[model samples]
Target: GVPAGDVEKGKKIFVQRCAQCHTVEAGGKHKVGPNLHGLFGRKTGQAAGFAYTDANKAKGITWNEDTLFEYLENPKKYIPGTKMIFAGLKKPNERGDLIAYLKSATK
Candidate 1:
């Protein structure tokens, strides 16, 4: 069975775990990293004013469901040298819910 974490739950989790560095809200601050709002379907490593890894810039990825899913599941595997320190979530359902929350974050 799919174990997608609830969007609401993911939001709470993200806020607790990731909000300190990553910005999920539009125009949010970049304490240690960049904003994650409007990420899916956007260009990879393209957040303005945020420094990114050369490795990330080299990938030239277009953010989408599949791409983000894999990346979110394992950031180090997706992009080396990125400063994101989150130990990826291992739960499939939580990943799903996080993805859902991310997809809906721009609204």
Candidate 2:
């Protein structure tokens, strides 16, 4: 389970770290990464129009709080061969905060 987190803090982190590669708003354009609208409850690599690597499509994982908590810690390790280049958030609280922000903003 993911720990409770601060949404405002998460937003700051997202703007600094994730906004360049991803977008959380609905109907937002895909940047270096896919737009993350409706991320929760969605299947991995299922975002429309973004070309995903076979490894990502083959993972067969759902995007939820628990899954995202682990994935955010070490994206490359969690999904080997994934094209996402994020170095992974080493701090658990930051991951939690980021997830909270994503959950709120991506809805």
Candidate 3:
């Protein structure tokens, strides 16, 4: 299970770290990365119309709090050969906070 987190701080973290590549709103446009609406509970590489690498398509991962908690700590390490370029969040609290924000915002 992931640790509890603050939504406000998570929003801040998203704006600073993830907004450049992704969007969390429902029906949001895809940017450099896919719009992350409906992120939790979805399979990896399932975002509509996004071009995913073979590695991502083959990962066979379902996005949930626990999976995301680990993935966001080190994307490349978690899914080798994935195209996402952002260095992962190293702080456990920040990862939890960001996941919390995504849970609400993406819905």
Q: Report the number of the highest-lDDT candidate.
A: 3
Candidate 1 lDDT (Cα, 0 to 1)? 0.75
Q: What's model 2's TM-score?
A: 0.97
lDDT of 2 by residue, 1-107 (tens): 88998999999999998999999898898988999999999999977889999988888999999999999888999889999999889899998998899999999
Clashes of 3: 0
lDDT per residue for candidate 1 within 37-69, as digits (tens), equals: 778777877777888778878878898767766
lDDT of each: 0.75, 0.91, 0.93
Query: Which parts of model 1 have CA positions greater than 4 angstroms off?
Result: 1-5
Of candidate 3, the 10-residue stretch with the lowest lDDT total is 78-87
TM-score per candidate, chains pooled: 0.85, 0.97, 0.97
**Candidate 1, 59: how far from true, in Å?**
1.7
TM-score of candidate 1 relative to the true fold: 0.85
| Span of ten consecutive residues with least summed lDDT in model 1 | 1-10
Query: Which residue window of length 10 is worst by lDDT in model 2?
Result: 46-55
Report the CA-based lDDT of candidate 3 relative to the real structure.
0.93
Q: What is the C-alpha RMSD of each candidate to the true structure, in Å?
A: 2.3, 0.7, 0.7
